[PDB]
Design a protein around this ligand. Sequence first.
Ligand SMILES: NS(=O)(=O)N[C@@H](Cc1ccccc1)C(=O)O
Ligand SMILES: [Zn+2]
Length: 307
Amino acid sequence: ARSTNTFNYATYHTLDEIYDFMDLLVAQHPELVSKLQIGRSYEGRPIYVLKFSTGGSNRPAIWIDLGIHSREWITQATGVWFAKKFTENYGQNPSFTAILDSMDIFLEIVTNPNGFAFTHSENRLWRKTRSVTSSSLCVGVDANRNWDAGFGKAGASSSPCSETYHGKYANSEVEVKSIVDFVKNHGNFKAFLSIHSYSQLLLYPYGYTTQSIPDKTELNQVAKSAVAALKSLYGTSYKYGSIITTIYQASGGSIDWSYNQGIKYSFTFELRDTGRYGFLLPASQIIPTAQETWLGVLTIMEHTVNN
Ligand SMILES: NS(=O)(=O)N[C@@H](Cc1ccccc1)C(=O)O
Ligand SMILES: [Zn+2]
């Protein structure tokens, strides 16, 4: 509570505790991390992004977002751990140090604030945002079906009450448009990673079309390598491939959008587990999950800095 060194990484936290955590981290490592507000959620909560940088002018960057689907608590928890990990490994780990000396990292721990708060107060399994639709009593949009990539096509629902409702139009959700604007304004992102749970998968584009991306071979080899590194810690087995061939057809997904923007290294991680606990993964698995997931993300970052 007092410093990031006394913060309990082995338990799930509320929105306010995570937000306070951000201010403690920035105050402890002002020369490495800064807090940016890229917008406000539907219910007015600020949307924060942590920027890790050793300097430079608009250096190529890595984007990482967690919790777009609020009920996937393991993601926001892994995000908090990542933030701390960055500050601890810079100057200690040769590989990660090399990356931060040439690239910036943007981390969005709570991509869907309103949904997260709701999972703490009313429905632990809430998935969508909390926006209100005109002609319906149902609330929320699936933020991972709201991006401008095959928007409205098969793999999403036009029903406001559906768990996979895509919304009135692409980027209708302020939580999504805030990211879209920031990334387009930045113009120099080289990697885009969106974290989810569960089922243990590493996926690349596309989800809305059966068409194969032109960088299929390279991304597949990168995924294979990332999966091998992640498995080395506790033996956690991951499967990998394109969204549509590995899990199911899904339209309006974020990495399909990022890839079509020219960001070649676009991947989505579906963390632990495989169904035993699902979204209600025990707090005792937070650290081990984050630790192994780190090796997988580091692997992708390494390939990016050199390519
Ligand atoms: N967390 S999940 O169980 O919702 N699965 C994800 C899979 C997914 C990930 C990235 C783009 C399209 C689809 C989903 O948004 O449906
Ligand atoms: Zn999800």
